[PDB]
RNA sequence: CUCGUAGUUGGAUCUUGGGAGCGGGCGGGCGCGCCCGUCCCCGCCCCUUGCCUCUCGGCGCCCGGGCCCGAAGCGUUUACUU
């Protein structure tokens, strides 16, 4: 059920497999042949999207999110059809690389590149939930003593795509990162 | 001020605001007037905001009416360019006028003849009343003043954005301020246009 | 104030100036708590309520008082017009 | 107190300001997707090219670098923001 | 080189404060001066504030309020042995009715009352009023 | 800062905060690596390699197209240069300065620039000593003035 | 008046990062529970941020072993606070 429609990388095998059956039905056509045959998700976890709804999240093994969107665009536009009523968007799966400066063990490699820290992975999370519309600002606001809010501003000419999906991002970010973000669309020079 | 569009912007003001020349102040600008402009010429003058003008003018009316009992507020110049206007504003308002020649110490010196006890200070212009404005900062009585782009603006609490150089504009200002203040007092219930015309407040070398 | 057990911190409350969110001293002269009439807004007529303005004394010399009371009136909602 | 909206002040002030002091500092440079007139292809250059890219369509030069800018003698398609 | 954005914050805020501007923008910043901002908020001297993101320095806009007098910055960076804490309280800050000297130590950020409550002292960097 | 110059002006750059890929002519990583290798191959300096890559192809940052940068990928190739940019440019203007002075000896106020030249190369030499792109000892007493000069 | 050795010093950032976390200690509406209080403050925690790999065994707990232990904290280090 997961031949190359779901490369195996973790323990559970439940909903990503049906999603993969949908993917293999999609890859029969002249825009997804051998392009939806290789970058296929491995895990998928159910969470909410906003209020009164729900949806499914896809974890690629994530060496792929560079060249993954070039099929993920077709993937949303042609699998929101067959799993409508919910939402799909590509995620960077990171368990986490734990903090380097705390150590007593040897099977945890000895130097940390930044690209595995908590912060770089977090900007990777923001990229994940909005790939096609770029981020054109980040003003960070403080709530009620020190709690967090993040206003984030996106490209004006790229609203044409994710506006009925306006709360979905900040819905996912709460579980992925833990705080509250909003997405406005500023003035352009 | 106000949420009544009838007190607010109407043609009833512009038909005379453009007639006088109320949309031009002067060449240069002090750093305390940027609140009251919208456009700039290619010709060396700044064209003030008449809407903000009427805004702070109606606030000026609010201040003038918060005078709970009118006998106790001074309207002042010492320049004849607004001497006639202040005289004919006080004569019909009730609050006392001073114009032409002032005497330092009248409301500052403890012992004084013409020791007057105002409760608000109205000045034609800060560049026109040097000493009385300082004495208004000396005694706890608020200050209302016209304001040009050029003019120094110190100690000004209530600002009226307009050119104060010219008899025509300043006469429009007094002549419409009187109506506005009495309007918000309520003696004028939008029953009439007021029969006095702005030639009355354009200063005269009296030969009539 | 006068707390219950006598944690006496105020002999009284001096007139606080809100036009710049700053307190003044006892011996001032330009901290002027002017009154402003309230309108009825059935004709715009004066009616019996107070819009007050008491700025810290020293700002008048800088001549920011007009601007500060502009902000105060706009916020107070007796002035609504904004370009 | 002539305090300006510091979370977000007026736009034109930031552009008129020097790029290095901005609310967020972004360059005064754009990119040049020019024609190099005289040939049926279209090629691009750095909009302040301090090393020339030859204009072999009219048998001439494309970019004379003049100070902090690259000024074009013959070149058609100026293109604005793309990013 | 340019130095000590903590000190530069405590000078820029007092540069603008006696001039009375409602908010202020400061070019540099750090997580630790952010942390002073938060300690300041827990007493309420400042209000909420915004953290303008420019990876080059990180700018801060913060509101100034009539809840404040000044806050000092101490380079060199000492240590409060928890004997000297009362000394520093009584000789730097103007009041025991407000204002509470600041310490970076092995129990988080803190001001001196909460430091004494957790019984752990450390470096002086701040003291406000 | 700013000792060796009395002027304080700076006009270097402030890259687009948006770390996004440029996207005017994408000209993706393949030909970019080819041009980077060509530029380094024929005997060019990273400071002008970047200028060429911004001029013809067009780049705001090589790290944007490809994670490894010019110095990194040359160092992974094997084309590390003789001496780095800051030692070499100051050396090749020092040669001109010393040519000047010893051709017009009376220029008492250009010895004052020669001295800052041994000082700047001395600072950067004891820097690149710890950088260890230079041997643990690297000797410039103006005895290294023309060893690399033909 | 310039340079410069020691000379004393020094950008940002490489977790102040989420949970309804639980028992317990609290400011507080309510009557320490729901909770507002970036895990309000820790033993037990959960996304992480270090280790039983090794002997006989402690309520465990499974069938001489193993999730934690021990004698004991052996996978960098120092400064500095209890």
Domain locations in chain A as residue ranges: 1-189
CA dihedral C49, C51, C56, C58 (to 10 degrees): -110
Give the Cα separation of D62 and D73 in Å (integer): 6
Interchain CB contacts (distance < 8 Å): B and C: 121
Last residue of a domain, one of E68, E83, E117: E68
Q: Which domains does chain F have, with CATH numbers?
A: 26-80 (no CATH), 81-150 (1.10.287.10)
Strand G contacted by F33 CB (< 7 A): no
Give the Cα separation of C22 and C16 in Å (integer): 7
Residues A41, A6 contacting (CB under 8 angstroms): yes
Looking at chain D, how many residues does it have?
83
Which residues contact residue B30 at a Cβ distance below 8 angstroms, ignoring those fewer than 6 apart?
A: B149, B150, B151, B152, B153
Give me the sheet containing A55-60, strands edge to edge. Answer: A43-47, A55-60, A90-92
Give the Cα separation of A135 and F17 in Å (integer): 10
Within 10 Å of residue A98's Cβ, how many Cβ atoms? Answer: 12
Give the Cα separation of A90 and B178 in Å (integer): 69
For B106, the token pair is: 């009248």
Residue ranges for the known binding site of D are 36, 39, 55, 58
Residue in this structure with the two tokens 């948006």, named with its chain if needed: F18
Total count of domains within chain E: 2
For B36, the token pair is: 């009251």
Identify the CA nearest to A66 among candidates F29, F13, E100, F52. F29
Contact residues, C window 6-25, toward D, CB-based 8 Å cutoff = 20
**What is residue C12's three-state secondary structure?**
coil
**Fold for domain C1-83?**
Hypothetical Cytosolic Protein; Chain: A; (3.30.1230)
Give the Cα separation of B17 and B176 in Å (integer): 10
Scanning every residue of chain A, which has its alpha carbon at the shortest distance from the alpha carbon of F21? A134
Annotate A134-151 with DSSP letters as a single string. -EEEEEEEEETTTEEEEE
Give the Cα separation of C38 and C47 in Å (integer): 5
CA distances from E57 to A140, A146, E50, F1, F2 (A): 14, 21, 14, 17, 20
Residues B74, B96 contacting (CB under 8 angstroms): yes
**In CATH, what number is assigned to the domain containing residue E86?**
3.30.1490.10
Which residues contact residue A116 at a Cβ distance below 8 angstroms, ignoring those fewer than 6 apart?
A: A94, A96, A97
| Domains in chain C: boundaries | 1-83
CB-based contact F14 E1, cutoff 8 Å: no
- Which other chains touch chain B, taking contact as 3+ CB pairs less than 8 Å apart? C
Identify the CA nearest to B7 among candidates B126, B144, B177. B177
**What is residue B20's three-state secondary structure?**
helix
D55 φ, ψ (degrees, to nearest 5): -100, 90
- Chains B, F in contact, 3 or more Cβ pairs below 8 Å: no
Q: Say yes or no: E63 and E77 in one domain.
A: no
Is C23 at the interface with chain E, CB within 8 A? yes
Which of D25, D33, D53 shows the shortest C-beta gap to F14?
D25
CA of A63 to C1' of G54 (A): 39
Burial degree of A44 (CB within 10 A; 0-12, 13-18, 19+): buried
Annotate E73-111 with DSSP letters as a single string. E-SS-----SSTHHHHHHHHSS-SSS---EEEEBTEEEE
Give the Cα separation of A40 and A7 in Å (integer): 7
- In units of Å, what resolution does this entry have? 3.6
**In CATH, what number is assigned to the domain containing residue E5?**
3.30.1370.30
Which helix (H) or strand (E) segment is C72 a member of?
A: helix C65-76
Strand G contacted by E15 CB (< 7 A): no
Domain that holds residue E86: 69-129
Residues 16-35 of E with CB within 7 A of strand G: 28, 30-32, 34-35
Give the Cα separation of A179 and A177 in Å (integer): 6
Identify the CA nearest to E40 among candidates E104, E100, E88. E100
Residues 37-76 of A with CB within 7 A of strand G: none
B192 φ, ψ (degrees, to nearest 5): -140, 155
Q: Say yes or no: E61 and E5 in one domain.
A: yes
Give the Cα separation of B150 and B25 in Å (integer): 8
CA dihedral E100, E101, E105, E108 (to 10 degrees): 30
Give the Cα separation of A130 and E3 in Å (integer): 37
β strands within A104-168, DSSP E: 135-143, 147-154
DSSP letter, residue A98: P
DSSP letter, residue F55: I
Last residue of a domain, one of E34, E68, E102: E68
**What is residue F106's three-state secondary structure?**
coil
Scanning every residue of chain D, which has its alpha carbon at the shortest distance from the alpha carbon of C72? D1
CA F80 from chain centre, in angstroms, equals 13
Is E20 at the interface with chain C, CB within 8 A? yes
Residues E103, E122 contacting (CB under 8 angstroms): yes
Distance from CA of D47 to the nearest CA of E (A): 24
Q: Return the closest nucleotide (C1') to the Cα of A112.
A: G14
Burial degree of B157 (CB within 10 A; 0-12, 13-18, 19+): buried
> Determination technique for this PDB entry?
cryo-EM
Scanning every residue of chain E, which has its alpha carbon at the shortest distance from the alpha carbon of D1? E21
Identify the CA nearest to C64 among candidates E24, E19, B125, D1. D1
Give the Cα separation of A5 and A13 in Å (integer): 12
Q: How large is the greatest C-alpha to C-alpha distance in chain D, in angstroms?
A: 61
Give the Cα separation of E104 and B82 in Å (integer): 66
Is E23 at the interface with chain D, CB within 8 A? yes
Residues A133, A155 contacting (CB under 8 angstroms): yes
Distance from CA of F1 to the nearest CA of E (A): 5
For F119, the token pair is: 């000082």
For A176, the token pair is: 């992925």
Is D67 at the interface with chain C, CB within 8 A? no
Cis peptide before C49 (omega within 30 of 0): no
Q: How large is the greatest C-alpha to C-alpha distance in chain E, in angstroms?
A: 42
């Amino acid at each position: 059920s997961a031949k190359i429609v779901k490369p195996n990388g973790e323990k559970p095998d439940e909903f990503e497999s049906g999603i993969s059956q949908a993917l293999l039905e999609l890859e029969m056509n002249s825009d997804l042949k051998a392009q939806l045959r290789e970058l296929n998700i491995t895990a998928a976890k159910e969470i909410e999207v906003g209020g009164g709804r729900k949806a499914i999240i896809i974890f690629v093994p994530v060496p792929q999110l560079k060249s993954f969107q070039k099929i993920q665009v077709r993937l949303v536009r042609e699998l929101e059809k067959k799993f409508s009523g919910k939402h799909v968007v590509f995620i960077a799966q990171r368990r986490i690389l734990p903090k380097p400066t705390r150590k007593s063990r040897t099977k945890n490699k000895q130097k940390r590149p930044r690209s595995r820290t908590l912060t770089a992975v977090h900007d990777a999370i923001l990229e994940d939930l909005v790939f096609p519309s770029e981020i054109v600002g980040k003003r960070i606001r403080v709530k009620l003593d020190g709690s967090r809010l993040i206003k984030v501003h996106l490209d004006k000419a790229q609203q044409n795509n994710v506006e009925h999906k306006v709360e979905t991002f900040s819905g996912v970010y709460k579980k992925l990162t833990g705080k509250d973000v909003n997405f406005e669309f500023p003035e352009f020079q | 001020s106000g949420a009544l569009d009838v007190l607010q912007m109407k043609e009833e003001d512009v038909l005379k605001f453009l007639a006088a020349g109320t949309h031009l102040g002067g060449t240069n600008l002090d750093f305390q007037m940027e609140q009251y402009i919208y456009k700039r010429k290619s010709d060396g003058i700044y064209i003030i905001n008449l809407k903000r003008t009427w805004e702070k003018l109606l606030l000026a009316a609010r201040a003038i009416v918060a005078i709970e009992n009118p006998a106790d507020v001074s309207v002042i110049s010492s320049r004849n360019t607004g001497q006639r206007a202040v005289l004919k504003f006080a004569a019909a308002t009730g609050a006392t006028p001073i114009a032409g020649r002032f005497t330092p110490g009248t409301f500052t010196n403890q012992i004084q003849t013409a020791f007057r006890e105002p409760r608000l200070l109205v000045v034609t212009d800060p560049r026109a009343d040097h000493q009385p404005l300082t004495e208004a900062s000396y005694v706890n009585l608020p200050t209302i003043a016209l304001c040009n782009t050029d003019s120094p603006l110190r100690y000004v609490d209530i600002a009226i954005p307009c050119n104060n150089k010219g008899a025509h504009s300043v006469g429009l200002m007094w002549w419409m301020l009187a109506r506005e203040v009495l309007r918000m007092r309520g003696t004028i219930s939008r029953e009439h246009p007021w029969e006095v015309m702005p030639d009355l407040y354009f200063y005269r070398d009296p030969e009539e | 104030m006068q707390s219950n057990a006598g944690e006496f911190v105020d002999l009284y409350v001096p007139r606080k100036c809100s036009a710049s969110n700053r307190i003044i001293g006892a011996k001032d002269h330009a901290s002027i708590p002017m009154n402003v009439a309230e309108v009825d807004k059935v004709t715009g007529r004066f009616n019996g309520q107070s819009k007050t303005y008491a700025i810290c004394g020293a700002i008048r010399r800088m001549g920011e008082s007009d601007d500060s009371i502009l902000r105060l009136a706009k916020s107070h909602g007796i002035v609504s017009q904004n370009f | 107190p002539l305090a300006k909206d510091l979370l977000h002040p007026s736009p034109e002030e930031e552009k008129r300001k020097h790029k290095k002091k901005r609310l967020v500092q972004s360059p005064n440079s754009y990119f040049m997707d020019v024609k190099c007139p005289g040939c049926y292809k279209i090629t691009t250059v750095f909009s302040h090219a301090q090393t020339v890219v030859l204009c072999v369509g009219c048998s001439t030069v494309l970019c004379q670098p003049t100070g902090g800018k690259a000024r074009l003698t013959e070149g058609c398609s100026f293109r604005r923001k793309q990013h | 080189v340019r130095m000590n954005v903590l000190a530069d914050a405590l000078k820029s805020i007092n540069n603008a404060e006696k001039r009375g501007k409602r908010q202020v923008l400061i070019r540099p910043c750090s997580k630790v001066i952010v942390r002073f901002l938060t300690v300041m908020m827990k007493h309420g001297y400042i209000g909420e504030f915004e953290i303008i993101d420019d990876h080059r320095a990180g700018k801060i806009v913060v509101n100034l309020t009539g809840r404040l007098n000044k806050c000092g910055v101490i380079s060199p960076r000492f240590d409060v042995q928890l004997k000297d804490l009362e000394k520093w309280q009584n000789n730097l800050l103007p009041s025991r009715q407000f204002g509470f000297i600041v310490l970076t130590t092995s129990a988080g950020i803190m001001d001196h009352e909460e430091a004494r409550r957790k019984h752990t002292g450390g470096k002086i960097l701040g003291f406000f009023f | 800062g700013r000792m060796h110059a009395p002027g304080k002006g700076l006009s270097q750059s402030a890259l687009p905060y948006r770390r996004s890929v440029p996207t005017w002519l994408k000209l993706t990583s393949d030909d970019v690596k080819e041009q980077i290798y060509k530029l380094a191959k024929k005997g060019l300096t990273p400071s002008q390699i970047g200028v060429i890559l911004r001029d013809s192809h067009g780049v705001a940052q090589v790290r944007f197209v490809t994670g490894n940068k010019i110095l990194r990928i040359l160092k992974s190739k094997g084309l590390a240069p003789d001496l780095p940019e800051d030692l070499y440019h100051l050396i090749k203007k020092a040669v001109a300065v010393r040519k000047h002075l010893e051709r017009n000896r009376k220029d008492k106020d250009a010895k004052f620039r020669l001295i800052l030249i041994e000082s700047r190369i001395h600072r950067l030499a004891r820097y690149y000593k710890t950088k260890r792109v230079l041997p643990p000892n690297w000797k410039y007493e103006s005895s290294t003035a023309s060893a690399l000069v033909a």
